[PDB]
């Protein structure tokens with residue numbers, strides 16, 4: 001099922017890092033000088049939006065060809081830059097004054113880069129979290145204190161807390177993802193202890209991931225998230241403010257609908273749903289958000305689905321330790337889902353009631 005680079009490590013074609021998992025390892029922070037005008041706007045989005053200067057600034061940009069973005073990391077940075085500018089341009093200050101046409105000198109390079117990466121031309125999780133970070137000190141570990149985001153939308157939008165805590169959850173889960181190949185090898189070799197320890201390691205990492213997730217409350221304010229950050233994560237699919245979608249000037253003639261952010265864009269949920277065998281209007285939206293994940297990660301999720309069932313192997317062994325380790329994994333994953341639902345309630349549904 002899962003293609004392997006060697007006897008120990010999954011194929012590099014899945015673009016999954018041993019240390020940070022689905023996150024992009026050591027993201028590029030600076031683009032070639034050729035793109036300084038894009039970088040300036042993105043680096044100054046807070047003060048450009050607040051001063052009402054962002055849209056005029058974007059409308060004065062020249063056309064910059066994407067031909068000089070010659071590797072994956074520079075293209076991912078550029079997608080993040082152009083995606084943040086796009087959200088800022090469409091929604092503005094978030095009072096209802098929206099733009100229905102994205103200017104061509106952003107829309108064309110953005111859409112071509114999106115085609116290259118096979119991502120939709122709208123900000124997604126893989127941009128604003130998985131690639132939107134850096135280490136303050138390269139010699140220190142991956143901790144909140146030692147990390148920052150590359151871009152925010154508004155001063156006080158809590159985007160650092162929201163994005164970095166999400167990223168640290170993904171990094172915690174990375175230590176579980178790297179055990180997945182060991183789980184399937186242990187099943188094939190009928191290695192009881194190897195499988196038990198793999199399942200206990202996955203459980204322990206997902207439990208840690210929930211403890212990292214708990215940090216969200218200390219770095220994100222519900223009012224600022226609901227009334228500010230949520231705006232720039234909103235899309236134009238089923239949105240009455242952009243009922244037909246957005247016109248990408250110079251790329252498509254007709255407006256096009258693309259969805260805003262969703263927790264379904266994290267590959268962590270489907271990865272361990274499938275691994276543990278615990279995976280329709282909801283099924284259609286689920287599958288759609290899969291298409292908002294990096295294509296290599298979709299392919300990893302598919303290969304996982306092609307393997308034998310961990311759950312049926314474990315429950316056939318009359319083995320309490322194996323079943324308890326399996327159950328600990330399920331419990332951990334359910335607790336992450338349950339916590340996501342709590343965050344949706346405290347940071348969206350409640351603020352909306354008010």
Ligand SMILES: C#Cc1ccc(NC(=O)OC[C@]23CN(S(=O)(=O)c4ccc(C(C)(C)C)cc4)C[C@H]2C[C@H]2C[C@@H]3C2(C)C)cc1
Pocket residue numbers: 123124125128129165166169170213216230233260261262263264265266268269336339340341343344
């Ligand atoms: C573009 C874009 C865009 C921006 C951000 C996100 N965030 C995202 O996918 O986060 C995954 C989370 C889930 N949340 S959450 O706080 O419950 C959360 C709740 C609500 C949202 C939206 C609807 C506002 C987008 C996002 C997140 C944090 C993460 C922690 C754990 C649970 C999963 C996890 C990694 C396994 C998605 C699209």
